[PDB]
């Protein structure tokens, strides 16, 4: 829904959404062909579903297509430093796609602004939403006709007529972190078709036992997940599906 959301934050005021207590289909996400640029640096998209994390952050913003290369771990540039900086060590993926027909219009697209002027580079995963009037601030009088000082935010020039690379490309960068806390967002779990009355190796939520599964007669308590025997050998399991 975030990818298919109509509203996208600007590059300087990039939205920060904390994803927790759900499952994301990274296999389907990579299988999607709408993304022009799908670069993964921490975990390969093939193994991303298998890899399990605990916190996922989504940064939604719109940038010029030529700045997609600048949006990357260990990268330098106006966009890469002044309004969206990434750590040298990166655990995530970068997703970009064409958006010329979506947001670009015949009129000027001034809704998106970029931090043209900044005194120093920003720390990774830090946003400067303060629309301070004059970046340099040589004189605190705040004169309208600034000479050594200028407005850091400028409107993007977007036009579908060009279509050369200046067109806006929707870019979202993910961050997977291990906070030594139990997982909340994890990859999808593949469930094979269960087979009964056959000697089949099984794995029910980590039971990883081997034996032939038959329909049972014992009735569990609704909260109880799997049975047991006198000798502490598993002899009944509740099918999760």
């Amino acid at each position, epitope marked *: 829904e975030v990818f298919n959301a109509t509203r996208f934050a600007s590059v300087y005021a990039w939205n920060r959404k904390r994803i927790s207590n759900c499952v994301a289909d990274y296999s389907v996400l990579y299988n999607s062909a709408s993304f022009s640029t799908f670069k993964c640096y921490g975990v390969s998209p093939t193994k991303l579903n298998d890899l399990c994390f605990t916190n996922v952050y989504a940064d939604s913003f719109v940038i010029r297509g030529d700045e997609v290369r600048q949006i990357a771990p260990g990268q330098t540039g106006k966009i890469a430093d002044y309004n969206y900086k990434l750590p040298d060590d990166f655990t995530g993926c970068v997703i970009a796609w064409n958006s010329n027909n979506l947001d670009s219009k015949v009129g000027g697209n001034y809704n998106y602004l970029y931090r043209l002027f*900044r*005194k120093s*580079n920003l720390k990774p995963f830090e946003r400067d939403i303060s629309t301070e009037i004059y970046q*340099a601030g040589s004189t605190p009088c705040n004169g309208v006709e600034g000479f050594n000082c200028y407005f850091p935010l400028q409107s993007y*020039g977007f036009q579908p007529t*060009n279509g*050369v*690379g*200046y067109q806006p490309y929707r870019v979202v960068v993910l961050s997977f972190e291990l906070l030594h806390a139990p997982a909340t967002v994890c990859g999808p779990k593949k469930s094979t078709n269960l087979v009964k009355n056959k000697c089949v190796n099984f794995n029910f939520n980590g039971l990883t036992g081997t034996g032939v599964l038959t329909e049972s007669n014992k009735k569990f308590l609704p909260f109880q997940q799997f049975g047991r025997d006198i000798a502490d050998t598993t002899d009944a399991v509740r099918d999760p599906q």
Partner: antibody
Amino acid sequence: EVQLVESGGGLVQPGGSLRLSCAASGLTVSSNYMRWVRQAPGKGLEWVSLIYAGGSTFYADSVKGRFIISRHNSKNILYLQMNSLRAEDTAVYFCARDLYVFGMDVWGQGTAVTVSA
Amino acid sequence: DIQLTQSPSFLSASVGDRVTITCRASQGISSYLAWYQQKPGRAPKLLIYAASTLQSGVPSRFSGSGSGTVFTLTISSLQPEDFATYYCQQLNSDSSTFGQGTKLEIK
């Protein structure tokens, strides 16, 4: 007002190193977009190197790696180091102002830097 | 890379004559092109920055038009002392190239 003075043009030898100097009045080198553009005799201007306010140095394809830029905080003096120069690099280098998209305003005076052996 | 070229780069005209200087970029740069004026033995000066507009301090006789891959520098009143070498540069680019340049002289 604001004036930029360019100095440091003179004869050097191949493989040498000379410190180009640019003095800016009324500007702060810390929060400005210094850029170096040279003008060969009988030829137009051509970009050489670019440095952002906070770092992130940029270089042209022809002079990539060969040239290194490091501005000094002392009296907001702009500096441009040269390394592995060639005889084709003889030109009149010029200084720059901080405006990236709002269009440039002023340059340095510019001095020719003759490189030969 | 993006390359810029000005034509015919050598135009002769008299005073009070409209002269158009075109810098058609080989690659799209939208309206992010700046017009300069490099007098001989001096440093260049900007006339138009980004889209068609007027730099603070330049005469009002300088104007521009066009965007994308086509640009045009228009002078309504060709003063005797505005004949120099004009340059075009991509402002919103990490590697900002310069145009070939055009020469103006007394006809």
